[PDB]
Design a protein around this ligand. Sequence first.
Ligand SMILES: [Fe+3]
Length: 329
Amino acid sequence: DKTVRWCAVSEHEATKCQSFRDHMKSVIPSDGPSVACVKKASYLDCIRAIAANEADAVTLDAGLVYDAYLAPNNLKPVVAEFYGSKEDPQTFYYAVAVVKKDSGFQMNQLRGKKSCHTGLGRSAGWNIPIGLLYCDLPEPRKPLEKAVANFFSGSCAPCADGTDFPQLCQLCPGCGCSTLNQYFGYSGAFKCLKDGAGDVAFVKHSTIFENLANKADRDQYELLCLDNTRKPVDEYKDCHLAQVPSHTVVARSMGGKEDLIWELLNQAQEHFGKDKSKEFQLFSSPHGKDLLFADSAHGFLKVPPRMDAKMYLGYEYVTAIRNLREGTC
Ligand SMILES: [Fe+3]
């Protein structure tokens, strides 16, 4: 069978996945690649499901791709999304910290503030900011969730445990790990800042431009720079926390159908990719942002032969994560 079982996290993604399935059936030959949908409550459940041969693919943030690699899962990156433009595809993006205009605090003054993270263990939303603030956190720093909880004065860290670290869910009770949680994801962490729930939104450099069409609105927001100064939302090239690997679709390291996934996605972007069809959009949805794939994506590129997760992620980022768990002050 030439069916790729895509793992959809929750109702919204499941809806987009079915439209995906049907629009593919309509253009692809009866003997080509097919998409089936398997529904789960979180990406974590999708990881376990792929490893257990109950699903074949899921799109993970680079930080999550690291954890996907760790046993007993042993997942591996197979197809990466690319951003920017089709001419100059960027297999990376900038981790930023969006704040409102005149909130009066720098990076070295986040202590006691309310934060909005895209999700626990994610690049721009958790690994980068928390890695930088690691020493600023009060002892003891293990568990890390407890220290981040006591550092800030309430926040939203989707996928975090709210019974053990209740404050990491003060801004989004339960820390839902899917779009069911309005504060989940890039645009979820943004809504959290925009709606007034939090003081800072640890998102990516394109987040605000995806949510606010008019510049006048954007003028009421600022970025937190490394040198503890603020720069407008247009100057992320210089005002960002770090640069991170693009989101990537993962699959089993053995019998994972990596080539079918490529053949599927490669065909998917040709018919429904960026500005390709008015009927179906691989990179957008009426039901929400970033479903299955990020809205800021312009396409896919196959990851090299048997490329490990540590090899893919690279050395700098793979150490950044490592230092986060390990490391001292
Ligand atoms: Fe990300």
